[PDB]
């Protein structure tokens, strides 16, 4: 093909191989991040559709619900630069009030109860056999500006994610912290 540039596709259409060498845009609501790396944070998104390669460990997460918990294929791991990650993290916290550091709420926990759904820049391409990412970009969209931050039909798929999340996540959970995911919407 030609292969243009800052594409956008999902785990089910990343696009990477051998030769590959690219990079691709995807979405996501956070699922694992770590402080650790003083370089950077360390995190891995999920949803949204199902991965098929092969990358590696990925700690992942099992969100709320310990029923439909996304599994490795679905999610991946990422890493940015703190001062990228500062800037993608305050316009959030806008939306919020705190850094997902903060909304950590525990040392040896994990995020991914709160709908912080946002898209990246990543420079992804293989390593050792598998899909190695980095994300460069990173902003989290409220629910109705995001079709006017993310261009269309990856607009409308956010949309839907929300009607499909939310059967699929159960309601059960929406009562564990209404609050926070009656942002939209009555429940």
């Given at each position: 093909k030609m292969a243009r540039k800052d594409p956008?596709?999902?785990?089910?259409?990343?696009?990477l191989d051998t030769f590959e060498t690219k990079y691709i845009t995807m979405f996501g609501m956070l699922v694992s991040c770590s402080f650790d790396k003083p370089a950077f944070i360390s995190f891995v998104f999920s949803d949204f559709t199902k991965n098929d390669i092969v990358?590696?460990?990925?700690?992942?997460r099992y969100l709320i619900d310990y029923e439909n918990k996304l599994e490795l294929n679905e999610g991946f791991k990422a890493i940015m630069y703190k001062?990228?990650?500062e800037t993608f993290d305050s316009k959030l916290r806008k939306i919020f009030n705190n850094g997902l550091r903060d909304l950590q709420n525990g040392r040896d926990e994990n995020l991914s109860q709160y709908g912080i759904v946002c898209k990246m820049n990543i420079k992804?391409?293989?390593?050792?056999?598998?899909?190695?990412?980095?994300?460069?970009?990173?902003?989290?969209?409220?629910?109705?500006?995001i079709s006017s931050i993310a261009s269309p039909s990856q607009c409308e798929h956010l949309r839907l994610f929300y009607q499909r999340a939310f059967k699929r996540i159960g309601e059960s959970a929406i009562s564990r912290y209404f609050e926070e995911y009656r942002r939209f919407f009555p429940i």
């Open positions: 956008t596709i999902e785990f089910c259409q990343l696009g990358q590696n460990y990925l700690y992942d001062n990228q990650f992804v391409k293989m390593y050792n056999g598998k899909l190695n990412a980095i994300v460069r970009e990173c902003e989290p969209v409220p629910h109705s500006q």
